[PDB]
Symmetry: C6
Subunit: 75 residues, 6 copies
């Protein structure tokens, strides 16, 4: 039939708020997805470190390494 | 003789429910496989975080990074 | 002189029972190797989770991500 | 619309101070980004190991392996 | 001047006994290097699991995944 | 302006003593860099395992897997 490619899905999240779980991070990152590439490297702006709905640190602009991204969820 | 390629097997799971164990995740992810690519990145919909048959969190749409996928099992 | 390539060795295990240690798994996986690719992704059938000769969980069909495979041993 | 590629963002940080969280490191690295490549390997100069605003070790010149970089933040 | 490439060094170890430290393994692997490829996947024969000079498990034939190899040392 | 590529920096360390932190290693490796490749695999000679300025084990010749290298520092 048909299916939606992961890269297609992630690109559709550009300009929107997403939540990301990183392998080398205990808290999740929440911010606006400003850019992404085929290796799933992510560039977030207005980002913050969160533990669920609890904010723990303001980060602003950050770049996440794709091979260390575990899960991405539209917010 | 003959053999079934892993990528072939994973693609056959599209449209069906699968259980995934991630390297940077202590609980498994269960959801409908809506899309996958050659690097085994996975796009699940109607997903949930589970510990066996026990549901712990509703997630909805999520994208799993292929190099952090450990095991995939048809549900 | 001569040598046996790892990929050559793994392919020779197809159709046979193997034991696999995964980076993101504390127990080993034992099952029939039904398929493998150049990135060492593995497709096992009739698989089970074991701790040595002790069976802890029946799994059936599973796909193991190659970059998270640590060691493969013919059973 | 438009978006900023992660690699584009990281390159724009060259010549400036950045903070980096590594997967195999408990403390962050802070230093001047002197060079970077497409795999996000990083070359920092005048670097130091920090825990937030707390300096714990002087490092000087160091090269960080891209696949072990977790997060990069302009300082 | 000149230098010896890592892959060149590893290939020179073929046919000889080596000690390997794996990322997803607490004990080292010691065995005869029967084969290796450019991704540093390793095929050892007559292998054993060791903790220094202490043998803990006999393994025989095993294939080690290159990206999970940490250190290789001629024995 | 201009910048120094990480691979360029690492190659300039050939023939000199470097300190390396590995992801799957708790102690650092210190030795003479005899060879390196584009994936940052490293071949050290006269190497030793250290904890800062404290020597804990003599290693001699060792090959470090590039994707498990975390940080490299000229000694």
């Amino acid at each position: 039939g048909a299916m939606v490619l992961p890269n297609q899905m992630v690109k559709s999240m550009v300009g929107k708020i997403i939540r990301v779980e990183m392998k080398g991070e205990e808290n999740q990152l929440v911010g606006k997805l400003e850019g992404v590439d085929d290796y799933m490297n992510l560039y977030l702006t207005n980002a913050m470190e969160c533990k669920g709905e609890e904010k723990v640190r303001s980060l602003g602009e950050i770049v996440l390494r794709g091979n260390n991204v575990v899960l991405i969820q539209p917010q």
